[PDB]
Amino acid sequence: KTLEVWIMPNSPQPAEDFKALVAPFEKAHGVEVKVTVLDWGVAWTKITTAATSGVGPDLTQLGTTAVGAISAMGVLEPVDDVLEALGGEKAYLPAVWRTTRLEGARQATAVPWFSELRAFYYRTDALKAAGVNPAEMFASWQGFEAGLARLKASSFRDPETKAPLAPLCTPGKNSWDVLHNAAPWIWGAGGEIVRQAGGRWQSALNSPESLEGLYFFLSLAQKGYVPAESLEKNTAQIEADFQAGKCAVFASGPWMIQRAQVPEAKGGFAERTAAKNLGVAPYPAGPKGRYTFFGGSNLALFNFSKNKPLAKELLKYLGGPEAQVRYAQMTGMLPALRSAWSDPSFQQNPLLRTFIQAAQFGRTYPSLAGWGGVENLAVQHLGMAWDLVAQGRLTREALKDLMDKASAAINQALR
């Protein structure tokens, strides 16, 4: 008669939004869904305890990069049946399909719920003033850097700040998404964070391709295109700087589009020049291709659940077309179910349609049991690289030294 579901704070009123989302399910099945909101401050420790103790909810949200770790503990129920009901492998972007299982596992243990992806917002007024065309600027890395150089040389001033814009704003090391900000550049160069050989995983952060991508990105902040102050800040703070009219180009997710429609008084930026002059482009095509970072969250069923049939019916509901569109809107994310990308909620909005175009270039990390150690050691060393950038002292040699140190530590952790 009750299901217990743990979620993270994905929407502006996390428990109210989720309860509204599931109310039709509760009526149809005659059950009550009891939702607990795990603040991002405590979510991972609460989930880990549940997994280690065998005490916890029926379903939990999992970030896509946590699926391998929790699956490897052997505490998750298989959900092949739910995914086949939703259309199988072909119903999902392959990057999203990768997140349904521990890498190499025969069975699915997570149901895709919603996708985070990143694309560049830009100031359509600033690019027009600079004589930069977005089609050309985001067609290649060379065009990207050439567009920032035009934006740096431009005399354009924001009509409210009365100041020139930073060509590019990005966090450096002081953000939750350090690796995710770097990943499209690693991938575009032809690199990857880890590689498999003999079924054993090792770091590839020190490969020649990975180093080219990392240097291309980090060095933009050494060339005058990113303000030093940006490197102190997290993504949320850089989003505020863009809203305030201080940045011509910056990467974020689809939630900024809804923020642009909402008054400043209610936490949005509708009144600001940036909201009235807003563009989106995908990450620019690199040497070996165009990639869009995918993250977001899935749902999993603990094998100590007393209510596995009803929990699987809720997975099918949350994973399915109607709830996919409703919850994508609530969270400012993209549906995990790829069919939902053609819904008018995305297609009627030009900026959301650009996110849909970016989405087909999606790529994610391998679903490793040891992923958190990989990311943590990657980000420590990328941090030290960002510290050299802030001093104008990041050389190609210094970057290679730091990624060799990271690779040695990663390979030890993976063994």
Footprint on this chain of ligand SO3 (rule: CB under 6 A): 133-135, 219
Pairwise CA distance, residues 216 & 399, whole Å: 11
Residue whose CB is less far from Cl ion, 297 or 364:
364
Q: Under rule CB under 5 A, which residues in 344-373 are in contact with Cl ion?
A: 363-365
Q: Which is nearer to Cl ion, 96 or 280 (CB)?
A: 96
133 binds, among ligand SO3, Cl ion, none (CB under 5 to 8 A by kind): ligand SO3
95 binds, among ligand SO3, Cl ion, none (CB under 5 to 8 A by kind): Cl ion
- One-letter amino acid of 142: Q
Q: How far is the CB of 295 from Cl ion (least distance, A)?
A: 12
Q: Indicate whether 123 belongs to the interface with Cl ion (CB under 5 A).
A: no
Helix (H) or strand (E) holding 398: helix 396-414
Interface pick for Cl ion out of 38, 72, 83, 95 (rule CB under 5 A): 95
Burial class (CB in 10 A: 0-12, 13-18, 19+), 198: exposed
Q: Smallest gap, in angstroms, from Cβ of residue 193 to Cl ion? A: 4
Per-position x/- string for 305-344, each x denoting binding to Cl ion as judged by CB under 5 A, each - no binding: ----------------------------------------
- Residue with smaller CB distance to ligand SO3, 13 or 133: 133
Q: Which of 355, 365, 401, 397 is nearest to 179 (CA)?
A: 365
Query: Which residue, judged by CB position, is nearest to ligand SO3 in the bound state?
Result: 135
Q: What are the strands, taking DSSP E only, across 108-235?
A: 111-117, 119-123, 166-169, 194-197, 200-203
DSSP assigned state of 10: -
Distance in angstroms between the alpha carbons of the first and the last residue of the chain: 45
Only segment of 75-83, 173-181, 190-198, 304-312 that touches Cl ion (CB under 5 A): 190-198
Report residue 14 as tokens: 């996390």
Should residue 192 be labelled a site residue for Cl ion when binding is judged by CB under 5 A?
A: yes
Q: Which is nearer to ligand SO3, 135 or 265 (CB)?
A: 135
| Residues in Cβ contact with 104 at an 8 Å cutoff, skipping those fewer than 6 apart | 199
Contact (Cβ atoms closer than 8 angstroms) between residue 82 and residue 312: yes
Q: Is 193 in the site for Cl ion (CB under 5 A)?
A: yes
The amino acid at 287: P
β-sheet bridge partners, residue 194: 203
- Backbone φ and ψ for 224, nearest 5 degrees, come out as 95, 0
Tell me: does residue 375 bind Cl ion (CB under 5 A): no
Determine the interface stretch with Cl ion among 65-73, 89-97, 262-270, 386-394 (rule: CB under 5 A): 89-97
Q: Which structure tokens are listed for 366?
A: 């391998």
Binding site for Cl ion (CB under 5 A): 95, 98, 192-193, 363-365
